[PDB]
Amino acid sequence: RGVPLIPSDKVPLENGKTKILLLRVGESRQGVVGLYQPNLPGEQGMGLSVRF
Amino acid sequence: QVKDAFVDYIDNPREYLLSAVNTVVDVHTRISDL
């Protein structure tokens, strides 16, 4: 019905018996959003830092 | 110092050695990062 099925081996699977999820994403649509820490020392990426 | 204040000086003047005091400040990296 126009909504794609996305693969992820991280969805649990135990003797068969897995699960399927349906998401709406976005802050403006009141959906699901991810949260990260914007300013970091090191700051190798979005919410990621490497330090000596 | 002048001794018994000719002008003589004392042969064993006091020497002041600066002392050091230390403190280790520990901060978790998640507390400062977040």
Curated annotation (Swiss-Prot), chain A:
It comes from the Bacteria. Disruption phenotype: No growth phenotype of a single sprI or double srpI-cyd deletion mutant in the presence or absence of sulfur. Signal peptide: none annotated. Induction: Transcriptionally induced in the absence of sulfur, requires CysR for transcription. Part of the srpG-srpH-srpI operon. Present in when grown in sulfur-containing media, induced 7-fold after 48 hours of sulfur starvation (at protein level). The record marks 52 as: May bind cargo. Transmembrane segments: none annotated. It is found in: Encapsulin nanocompartment. Belongs to the encapsulin family. Family 2A subfamily. The 24.5 nm encapsulin nanocompartment is formed by 60 subunits; monomers form pentamers which assemble to form shells. There are 12 positively charged pores where the pentamers meet with a minimal pore diameter of 3.7 Angstroms as well 3-fold axis channels and dimer channels. Has 4 domains; an N-terminal arm not found in the type 1 subfamily, a discontinuous peripheral domain (P), an elongated loop (E) and the discontinuous axial domain (A). Shell component of a type 2A encapsulin nanocompartment. Expression in E.coli generates nanocompartments with an average diameter of 25 nm. They can be disassembled by treatment with 6M guanidine hydrochloride and reassembled with cargo. The nanocompartment is probably involved in sulfur metabolism. Probably allows passage of cysteine into its interior; during growth in light the physiological pH is 8-8.4, about 30-54% of free cysteine (charge -1) would be able to pass through the shell. This is Type 2A encapsulin shell protein SrpI. The gene is enc. The chain holds residues 211 to 262 of 306 of the full protein.
Swiss-Prot record, chain B:
Induction: Transcriptionally induced in the absence of sulfur, requires CysR for transcription. Part of the srpG-srpH-srpI operon. Present in when grown in sulfur-containing media, induced 7-fold after 48 hours of sulfur starvation (at protein level). Disruption phenotype: No growth phenotype of a single sprI or double srpI-cyd deletion mutant in the presence or absence of sulfur. It is found in: Encapsulin nanocompartment. The 24.5 nm encapsulin nanocompartment is formed by 60 subunits; monomers form pentamers which assemble to form shells. There are 12 positively charged pores where the pentamers meet with a minimal pore diameter of 3.7 Angstroms as well 3-fold axis channels and dimer channels. Has 4 domains; an N-terminal arm not found in the type 1 subfamily, a discontinuous peripheral domain (P), an elongated loop (E) and the discontinuous axial domain (A). Shell component of a type 2A encapsulin nanocompartment. Expression in E.coli generates nanocompartments with an average diameter of 25 nm. They can be disassembled by treatment with 6M guanidine hydrochloride and reassembled with cargo. The nanocompartment is probably involved in sulfur metabolism. Probably allows passage of cysteine into its interior; during growth in light the physiological pH is 8-8.4, about 30-54% of free cysteine (charge -1) would be able to pass through the shell. Belongs to the encapsulin family. Family 2A subfamily. This is Type 2A encapsulin shell protein SrpI. The chain holds residues 54 to 105 of 306 of the full protein.
